[PDB]
Amino acid sequence: AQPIVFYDIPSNERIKHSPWSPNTWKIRYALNYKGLKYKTEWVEYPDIAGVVQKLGGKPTEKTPDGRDHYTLPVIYDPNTKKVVEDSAAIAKYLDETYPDTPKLFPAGTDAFQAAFLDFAWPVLGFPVFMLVILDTANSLLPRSHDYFRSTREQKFGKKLEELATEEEWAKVEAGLAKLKGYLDANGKGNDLLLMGAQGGITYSDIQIASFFVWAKIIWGEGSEKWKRLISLHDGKWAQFYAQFTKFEQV
Amino acid sequence: AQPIVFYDIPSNERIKHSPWSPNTWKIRYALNYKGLKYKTEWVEYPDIAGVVQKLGGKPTEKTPDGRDHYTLPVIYDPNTKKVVEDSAAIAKYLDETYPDTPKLFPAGTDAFQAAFLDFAWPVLGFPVFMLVILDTANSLLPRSHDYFRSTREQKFGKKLEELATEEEWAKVEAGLAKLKGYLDANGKGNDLLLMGAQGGITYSDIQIASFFVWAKIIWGEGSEKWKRLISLHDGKWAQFYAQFTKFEQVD
Ligand SMILES: N[C@@H](CCC(=O)N[C@@H](CS)C(=O)NCC(=O)O)C(=O)O
Ligand SMILES: N[C@@H](CCC(=O)N[C@@H](CS)C(=O)NCC(=O)O)C(=O)O
Description:
homodimer, alpha+beta, Glutaredoxin, Glutathione S-transferase Yfyf (Class Pi), Chain A, domain 2, four-stranded mixed β-sheet, 8 helices, 52% helix, binds glutathione
């Protein structure tokens, strides 16, 4: 079979040109975990809309003014001749199109995952975003930097330099405390995956891991910031995240 | 099998002494759904702390003052001689202790349900509360009314009479729109239970149903407010809720 074409956002030498996006990483994870062959095409932030339109793909939401908003990840599957957008929809497509691969949406879990996904950004991803947003912008190629900084600063009404605070660190920890609580409901020995030790990795687990790999890559694995995040709750997150390192092929 | 003892909050003639609490209804639903025998013991709000302590039960949370906070539902199972508190825990206990009964927490769902349940009040339960809180209070016995009005008005900083607004109605509709979105992920034919048509009722489904039975009992099934609520999203919620009426036995 031909490699799926995977559209991702590039980076500069600060992070050695590593992919970095929490949103595209969900799909890089899905592909690596499923053992599917793919090739990465690199698209700068301001070129996303153009590229996706030229592919025949669709926007995934609308900006506050009401304009179509195009996002990555997007894939083109040469085996089905289909373009697929929106990370959750892409993961589901992968399950359905490649049924011999491990399922990210086991039967009976779709609505539960939809709900979990809907709260992952407010409770965890957004506070993390604030802690990594400046270093993210500085890891972008020049044209991406200008688009990202201008649009994100416009959005939050602050310079990117003002967003990371200790209050955001408290929000991250509080969000991870909630998550630890949910995982605790599975019982001892089953509290490192949402569906338990023998449940396997779901799309929802990947969503949490994608927040971690984002922070790790942007901050640096040898950094103190990374060490601070990963050390919370007595090293629980180091254990959780360590489950995903085998699936970080680039 | 001896009946489980089920501790619930009583009400006055306005709703013909019917059980009404969305919290105790989660366990009423669980017991009914599982077909377990039980009997209700009625406890007024200000008496809950003393009654649970006497049972040898435990508080379920901490008040901001760092004091113990006792809540219903609580059960006493004479078959195991166990007192169990906190509705989610009671439901889990019922799964484990009575394995022949239909599961409320299917294998692999515990954490997903914990997350869902944590979302349920802020997304949907709380705006429903604002629209039923006055009528709820006016359905309580006098000692319960006094305690409930005192504590809840202190909590929300307004008179109970001031809590229902159209903004709350909009928040209710928005909350249901989110839930409808989650259910749509299951696909047509599977979008009326969280785990789909063949997955069966979960504790999480019962949590949503408990908001509906609460409003129905408090408002009255013939009320225009009830008709307005279940007519949202082209009557989807009328269909969702109708699944549960077969489990609304009241001893
Ligand atoms: N709902 C989308 C969101 C993806 C998303 O926001 N991706 C970012 C990259 S991290 C993006 O392409 N933003 C487009 C822009 O800023 O114009 C998904 O999950 O795929
Ligand atoms: N977390 C508890 C909360 C139950 C709860 O808040 N029940 C209310 C009755 S609707 C209560 O006993 N509140 C006692 C009080 O306000 O003092 C549970 O889910 O069982």
